[PDB]
Amino acid sequence: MITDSLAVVLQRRDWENPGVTQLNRLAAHPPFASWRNSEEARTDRPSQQLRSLNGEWRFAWFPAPEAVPESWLECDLPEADTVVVPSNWQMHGYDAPIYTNVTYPITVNPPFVPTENPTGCYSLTFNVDESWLQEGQTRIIFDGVNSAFHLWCNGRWVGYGQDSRLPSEFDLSAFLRAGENRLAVMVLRWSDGSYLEDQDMWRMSGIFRDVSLLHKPTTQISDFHVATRFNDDFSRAVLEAEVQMCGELRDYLRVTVSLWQGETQVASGTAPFGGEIIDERGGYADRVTLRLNVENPKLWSAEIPNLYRAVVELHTADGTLIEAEACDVGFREVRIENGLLLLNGKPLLIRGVNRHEHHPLHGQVMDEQTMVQDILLMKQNNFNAVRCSHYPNHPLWYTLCDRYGLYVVDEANIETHGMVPMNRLTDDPRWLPAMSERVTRMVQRDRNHPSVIIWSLGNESGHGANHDALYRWIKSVDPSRPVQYEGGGADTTATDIICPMYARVDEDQPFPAVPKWSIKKWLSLPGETRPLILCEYAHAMGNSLGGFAKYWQAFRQYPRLQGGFVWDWVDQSLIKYDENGNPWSAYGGDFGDTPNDRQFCMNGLVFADRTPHPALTEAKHQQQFFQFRLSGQTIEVTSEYLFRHSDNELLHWMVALDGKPLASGEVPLDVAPQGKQLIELPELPQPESAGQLWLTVRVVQPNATAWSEAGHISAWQQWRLAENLSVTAIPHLTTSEMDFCIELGNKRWQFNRQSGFLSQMWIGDKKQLLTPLRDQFTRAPLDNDIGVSEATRIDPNAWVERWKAAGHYQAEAALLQCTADTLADAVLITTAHAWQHQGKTLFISRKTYRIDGSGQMAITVDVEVASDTPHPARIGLNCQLAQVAERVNWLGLGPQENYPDRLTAACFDRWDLPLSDMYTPYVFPSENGLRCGTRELNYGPHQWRGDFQFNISRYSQQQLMETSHRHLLHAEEGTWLNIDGFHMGIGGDDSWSPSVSAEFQLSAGRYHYQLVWC
Amino acid sequence: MITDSLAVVLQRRDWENPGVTQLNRLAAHPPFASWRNSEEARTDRPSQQLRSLNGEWRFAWFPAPEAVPESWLECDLPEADTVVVPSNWQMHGYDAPIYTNVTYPITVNPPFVPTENPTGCYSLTFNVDESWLQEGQTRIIFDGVNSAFHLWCNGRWVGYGQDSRLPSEFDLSAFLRAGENRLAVMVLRWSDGSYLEDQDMWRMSGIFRDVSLLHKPTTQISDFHVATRFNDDFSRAVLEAEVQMCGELRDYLRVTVSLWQGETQVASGTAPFGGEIIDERGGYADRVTLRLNVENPKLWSAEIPNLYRAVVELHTADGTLIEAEACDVGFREVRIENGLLLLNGKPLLIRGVNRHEHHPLHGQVMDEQTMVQDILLMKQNNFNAVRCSHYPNHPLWYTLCDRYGLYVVDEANIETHGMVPMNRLTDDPRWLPAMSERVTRMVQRDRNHPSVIIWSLGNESGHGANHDALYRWIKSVDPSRPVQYEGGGADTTATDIICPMYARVDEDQPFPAVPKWSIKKWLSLPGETRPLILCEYAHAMGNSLGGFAKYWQAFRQYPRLQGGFVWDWVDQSLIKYDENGNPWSAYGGDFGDTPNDRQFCMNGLVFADRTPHPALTEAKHQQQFFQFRLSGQTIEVTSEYLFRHSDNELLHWMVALDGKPLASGEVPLDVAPQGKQLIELPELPQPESAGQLWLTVRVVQPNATAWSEAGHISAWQQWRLAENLSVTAIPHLTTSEMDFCIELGNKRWQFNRQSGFLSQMWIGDKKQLLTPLRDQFTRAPLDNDIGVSEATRIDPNAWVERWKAAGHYQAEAALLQCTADTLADAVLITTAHAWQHQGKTLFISRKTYRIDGSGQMAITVDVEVASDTPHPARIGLNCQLAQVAERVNWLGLGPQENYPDRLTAACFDRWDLPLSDMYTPYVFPSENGLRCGTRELNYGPHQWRGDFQFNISRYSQQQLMETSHRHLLHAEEGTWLNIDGFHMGIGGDDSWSPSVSAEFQLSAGRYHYQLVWC
Ligand SMILES: [Mg+2]
Ligand SMILES: [Mg+2]
Ligand SMILES: [Mg+2]
Ligand SMILES: [Mg+2]
Ligand code: NA
Ligand code: NA
């Protein structure tokens, strides 16, 4: 009783000792259920011997582990509340979540953690049936506790446990009691294991994964591994099943492994225990290996997730079953051959994304509904791979990826980004035991899953000798999967794959000790033979993914460039509530948390509620499995599928002139994997009306799959066909000292002769303008334009910082000229302005306005940009229209928001969306909603014609600049229109340095665009 | 006080937990002294800041850790005794030492150890001066504690500590007190670390290495590494010195590294702290690297141990010294290039031996006198390398090897030989932390020593993924040394060198999973490129080392065969005392210890008191650095030295006829390393007297070295020169029914006509025989003949077992014929015997005795051996002479004991030694003292002539067989003579299977020898 007390238990402080990562934990193993019936094991029916302890527990919060009363070990505290397990207590409000990227949330003084260490005290009272107590072993499983904990059962201390993302299991046979039992779990927010958990995410704590009780027989299956070997043509396979036992060996004991394809058994093997000779002392008496021969196995892949059911049965020689274990088995082979990663003999092209385990309401607790949602959304957008971002995932995730077909990179829970230098602990042999635990237990838990094709040693922990040791350990224990690791320059001896973070396609980034080469240059470096897959690329923070097409062009052109994982899937935003009780998305620093990294937690392709960003469609288009070439009248369709024939594919093609359909067709796609199919279009229309003929093809899946509905579009492409160039009652000008007035029927135009801008336009007696039409050279800065710069530190190389230093946001227009001339059939208004900042002219705009007798006002704009000023974000016009209309109609690229470096997915057509659809609700507001390549734009009574880019919304660029949260934005009086002749790219290679390519930068000195308003 | 008590401290049972190998231990580092004066640091003068705690401590022994009273933490027990530290308490008699080879001394149930765990309680009361307490850090160092311990200082628990062969250091600053202080050390014999310490040696426990107090400044040198890079010709070298600091960094802090050659400084470097960029977070602020350029460095080797003194000084910018550290630096390079291990660019030939840390009186406590004795004896016998057998050694050993010139293989303390299978724990990731500690701390402690050229991962622990991980870790941390490991077949991915245990030269041993190829066949295996050095070969148990010349012939013939380490240096025998108080050598089971492996602990080339075995001279001759070829009149001398010229070498040559010197000479040896020198002998004598001319050369060192005296013979060789064949009063026979009597003057011969043997010989009236002269076909079995077989289990393939099964020791002679004929000038006695066992004739011996008128009795022996009986151990005669003489004089190979497969070191000559010198006192008695190639033997009045092998002593073969200890042997009435025509080899490849080569086996069916007695 004295040694079970908190005074004795907490005196050693195992959470400040990296030599102690666990006390009384059982060995790691593949997931178990201890079925007592082979048919239930085979059918994956719920097991009576696995009992979930999830539900309502009792919880008390304490500032430090020394504030917890000794009475809590005996009975529940009066001040304790009832909470739901699994959960995070920051999501219940007991303290604040912390978002930090690189800097540790605590003082960096390893292995010591703050004395004020927030402590959660969990209690559960539960009942155990006496049959569990009479015979067998009863263990508790904690699937995840953040970050360290101590365990009591009926007042007796059981074990400690540290690692937060792997299951923790303790034997409870000697502690449980017939009838009512109590569990006491003391959870510490900080431990020595927090130094290895510096991943860029919200810092939360508690029992955030499922807690369960498992009953096993005394003689039990303790471990089993499945391996699949193949011949050269994959027509024959061998399933090797190694089974280990615990308890007393008996001669009558047998293990049978049966393989099942649906309800049909395909192979079976029975043997007594006792393996082959290992060394001079013999072999494993408590192990057995079964070799099941499979002829014409069905191969697992992301395209066809062919799964077998393997049932391992421990039974007596007479036949009585003791315990059954089951796992899903995929027949696939992963290997790197001649510098290429092959799956089933074919080179892989990774269409991957990094995924964190995040929920906007439950924090870091994962449920099956959200996992299935994520997987379906990924596969509907042509992703075939997922990287478990910097920790092992919820166990159900790997099973779901097996069943649905996603390749998985499983990562050890090891990140030390905030260490100086980054390898300070990973080059220290005193932390080798902790890292080795974090790697070995992950491999032991997840080595049977077919979706797992690559092991990862962790993320951003430098390069140390511990990494080399653990890489070699993984290669020895599991040779069937390659190992990757990015720290230390992404090409060290601890990686089988060059996996740079945000390396660019064509630009080298020569950092002093860890250079970031361009991916094409990296491949050809002297002595380099390995394949390159970017572990992180195309940073998706806010309005991002510019230059994605460049990455995918390089991916398809260079063999050893085998793809990458986009960073990342979902924004790690949380839900807060305002004074009115309404929910809003929150990022770093919105909870009062100690030094934070603000909005850098939201880098996802979908919002926290899994609503897609506009960049998701760009990723889908660039990652599509069908490539199209147009030669004259023939469409060539190339299949990028490696294994499957296009047996649920149908190509639809349309020809339109200006969004007016002229021809349409449909052919069934019959193309072999990596094959070609030539498609002859019928005699195509030859219209005589002016316009540009457009050919659009689409791949539509007529039927439903497990992850998609009927009619799912999986690929598309558009081309320009033959163009036909266009070959085809006087406005009255009134002059006053203050204005230029032009009248034509019910239409009036006002030009202020002091500002040199069109102040007002009348239709009848109704004003059309709330703000004058003026040149705009700036945008509300994007996250890529800001890039790590802040008001306190400031990065002078960021685009927003250079624009502010040059005075683009503070530039003042000076009227250089303003003259009106009445032509024979039109009124000509010629204006000139100079935008100057502190005696330096940045831009000159010379404009012409021509109002003809047909009511059309053609505007010609010529803009000069000083070569020594930083390149402007846009050359266009902006105004606030007085009218709010429900629908926005335009002819151009759409229907989603698209930008000059992110418009490949956009198709030219006629689009009609509501005004709300024209605004992208980025949680951090910025410039958004732009539509490029637009020839015609209609909003209410106004039509704009030409070749321009535009965005339309109820928010101004100034409001988007000055507002930090999207729930603090208010619709303004009218509609803000931003029509642009030229727009700068958005970047996306990274979000801490400028990443817009030079060809997407407005670097020409002179620009010209025309525009018609009618 | 409650948490410091034994009830709370011992409740966790950290000695049954392999997850806990230490509590509150400081980091491992190179040896420190914390000099406060640079000159004292340079001159290696004793440091005032390092205080030895060796002396008289207080000791109490307990059956289990739970028997220790709580009062012991406060004051010394009345029952406690005063003992000397360092020591082993088994050597003080508190419990018995255990000798076991493979089987664990405890029940194999990891990680659990017996409840009855013997416990030693050590106490020291000491004083600390207040200057130590005012400022700085005070730490205690335990150089070695077996096997685990807990530490208290003034009643407060400090730390646990497990690993037994590496230093354990604990900070005592917060525990010490001004004035008197008490230390309490509770030492446990068994822990979870005992499973990794299953080395074949005596099992002892206690504080067997030195205990010391170190005072360091608060700002201190925490770690430093020295590295030497070279150019292609080794004319230029760079000394890289990396220094780490602990405490608060200050800008005025400096580190200076100066290199000293004697009293002359050769290089120096000063720098502030702050290393180069390591990664994206920068570099080590608390580290600095100095690069000292050395032109024409003097290179360290075993032949010339050229040493530099490096002084590392932490000091302020103004100049004030804070702390100085010093280490001896050798400039050498070790690398494997094209399958050869090179030192300083030259291929190495390892003349190595395995050495255990053993003392016959102090157990496993090492002192400088015995270390120096061992090193001098090794270098005097042409050893140039030593393998630290299965654990890191006493720190002074590496320094002594640096100063004297021995190559060192440093081995981690990891052996699991008794596990089934052997890799049960080394393939378990739950033991990876313990093994990683045992490897990393050894490397960290010993990485600066120039004598250490090869790292070893341990011994006989199978092959697991932990070995691969730790091999990769060593390769990453210290690339300057290759790593070897023998477990798992000696050629796995965890070794840079193929290092088989007892692989043979020409015979393969194909074991099921771990085949032991012949070393020549191993090199050529498909895909094999690595060098081969036998980590253990030529087992030296008892009368052993037969076939050593075969190993060394292969070593010099095959390039990639680069030598090996003999097993082993010294017998691990202990000293017990009889009833009369006299000391005797004891082996396993002589202390009553639980199942033991008897005399298998004594496999040394020298006795426990470091007295050489006869096999040491054979090793010396086979390992000599000068090879000799004789062509006509010219001696060709080849130097096997790689670096040194023969500048202390002088060749002496002698020509003798029958031990009578005819010519002698002397030439100064002037031969370059790996060079040749032709030596023209003067016109050699051409004697006309019959006999065989013999040329003997010797290499004598005229001067003294650090390890040898003046006149040291280092190499020798003998050849046969021209031979001149020999070209050049009646005994009365009396016949009776019982005897044949021959008389010639005062000489009489008696032949029993019932046994058919010469019963008695008279000179005057004095009997010359105590036992009749009879054929002998057996020997007292050697350790190689016994080979693991015992009366309980019995190995049927052992030579002694086959001889006993065939009945060689129980064979009975049957008289086939006995007839005497008187020739014209002589008496002819013809006898025939058949030795039969259960109706099966094994040997037939037909003899002729011819006594001429000159008193000579020539004996002709013809022996037939049945082809289906096992080959006999010898074909000779044995008798017990009635006379004991002081001197044994013979002309033949000598003067040491030599056998047909161990006679290359023996030289033909005339030898005169006392009768005691003719007996080898092997601790386990056996056949010994044999001298081969003997043409003349004189013992008192008797002369024996012919070509024979003989051994002469006061012990009979039956007595040697029936006696198990050499102190239980008693001299018999007369002298036992064993003259043999033919003798079987002794073997030595291993001592658990038959190892005598077929050409050394008496496999011919018929044998003949002649003999003259006069
Ligand atoms: Mg810990
Ligand atoms: Mg990071
Ligand atoms: Mg332990
Ligand atoms: Mg052994
Ligand atoms: Na590629
Ligand atoms: Na050689």
Among B972, B848, B349, residue whose Cα is nearest residue B641 = B349
Q: CB-based contact (8 Å) between B977 and chain A? A: no
Angle at which helix B395-404 crosses helix B368-379, to 10 degrees, equals 40
Inter-chain contact A421–B12, Cβ cutoff 8 Å?
no
Among A224, A150, A144, A170, residue whose Cα is nearest residue A26 = A170
Q: Name, in order, each residue with C-beta under 8 angstroms of A790's C-beta and a sequence gap of 6 or more.
A: A598
**Cα of A348 to ligand 5 centre, how many Å?**
8
* DSSP calls for B791-850: TTT--TTSHHHHHHHHTTTT-EEEEEEEEEEE-SSEEEEEEEEEEESSS-EEEEEEEEEE
CA B83 to chain A, closest CA, distance in angstroms equals 33
* Spacing of C-alpha A305 from chain mean position: 22
C-alpha B803/C-alpha A227 separation (Å) is: 52
Question: CA-based angle B466:B472:B474, to the nearest 5?
Answer: 100
Among residues A460, A486, A618, A927, which one is catalytic?
Answer: A460
**Cα of B198 to ligand 4 centre, how many Å?**
6
- Contacts of residue B493 in chain A, CB cutoff 8 Å? 476
C-alpha A554/C-alpha A523 separation (Å) is: 12
Q: Which two tokens stand for residue A128?
A: 């155990």
* DSSP calls for B30-73: S----BS-HHHHHHTPPPTTEEE--EEEEEEEESSGGGS-GGGG
Task: Tell me the three state secondary structure of residue B365.
Answer: coil
CA B285 to chain A, closest CA, distance in angstroms equals 9
Q: CB-based contact (8 Å) between A512 and chain B? A: yes
Q: Which two tokens stand for residue A638?
A: 């190339």
- Report whether A942 contacts A881 (CB < 8 A): yes
Among A221, A333, A226, residue whose Cα is nearest residue A269 = A226
C-alpha B537/C-alpha B519 separation (Å) is: 11
- Residues of B labelled as active-site residues: 460, 536
Write b or e for each residue in B472-490: b if 16 or more Cβ atoms lie within 10 A of its Cβ, otherwise e.
bbbbbbbeebbbbbbbbbb
Query: Which three-class secondary structure string do you get for B904-957?
Result: CCCEEEEEEEEHHHHCCCCCCCCCCCCEEEEEEEEECCEEEEEEEEEEEECCCH
- Report whether B638 contacts B631 (CB < 8 A): no
Nearest ligand to residue A347 Cα: 5
- Report whether A477 contacts A436 (CB < 8 A): no
C-alpha B624/C-alpha B382 separation (Å) is: 6
Inter-chain contact B279–A487, Cβ cutoff 8 Å?
yes
Query: Which three-class secondary structure string do you get for B510-538?
Result: CCCCCCECCHHHHHCCCCCCCCEEEEEEC
Which residues of A make up each annotated binding site for Na(+)?
A: 200, 600, 603
Residue A870: left if φ>0, alpha if ψ -120 to 50, beta else—which one?
beta
Neighbours of B893 (CB within 10 A): 24
Q: Name, in order, each residue with C-beta under 8 angstroms of B840's C-beta and a sequence gap of 6 or more.
A: B807, B866, B869
C-alpha B675/C-alpha B638 separation (Å) is: 6
PDB experimental method: cryo-EM
- Contacts of residue B19 in chain A, CB cutoff 8 Å? 20-23
Which residues of B make up each annotated binding site?
A: 101, 200, 415, 417, 460, 536-539, 596, 600, 603, 992
Q: Which two tokens stand for residue B579?
A: 């009833």
Nearest ligand to residue A147 Cα: 1
Is beta strand A561-566 parallel, antiparallel or unpaired with respect to A350-355? parallel
Question: CA distances (Å), A551 to each of A174, A542, A901, in order?
Answer: 59, 19, 12
CA A21 to chain B, closest CA, distance in angstroms equals 8
Nearest ligand to residue B350 Cα: 6
* DSSP calls for B612-653: BPTHHHHHHHHT-SEEEEEETTEEEEEE--SS---TT-EEEE
Residue B592: left if φ>0, alpha if ψ -120 to 50, beta else—which one?
left
Question: Could you tell me which residues are beta bridge partners of residue A628?
Answer: A637
- Report whether A953 contacts A932 (CB < 8 A): no
Q: CA torsion sign, B787 to B791 to B792 to B797?
A: positive
Among A857, A817, A825, A847, residue whose Cα is nearest residue A942 = A857
**Cα of A40 to ligand 5 centre, how many Å?**
44
C-alpha A168/C-alpha A147 separation (Å) is: 12
C-alpha B536/C-alpha B504 separation (Å) is: 11
- For residue A352, the 8-state DSSP code is E
Burial (0-12, 13-18, 19+ Cβ within 10 Å), B417: buried
Largest CA distance in chain A: 112
- Report whether B457 contacts B412 (CB < 8 A): yes
Write down the residue that tokens 């380490």 correspond to: B565
Among residues A169, A486, A536, A649, which one is catalytic?
Answer: A536
- Residues B439-442: contacts with CB within 8 Å, 24+ apart? B439/B412, B439/B414, B439/B470, B439/B473, B439/B474, B440/A429, B440/A432, B440/B28, B440/B473, B440/B477, B441/A429, B441/B28, B441/B163, B441/B166, B442/B166, B442/B392, B442/B410, B442/B412, B442/B413
Among A166, A109, A669, A733, residue whose Cα is nearest residue A393 = A166
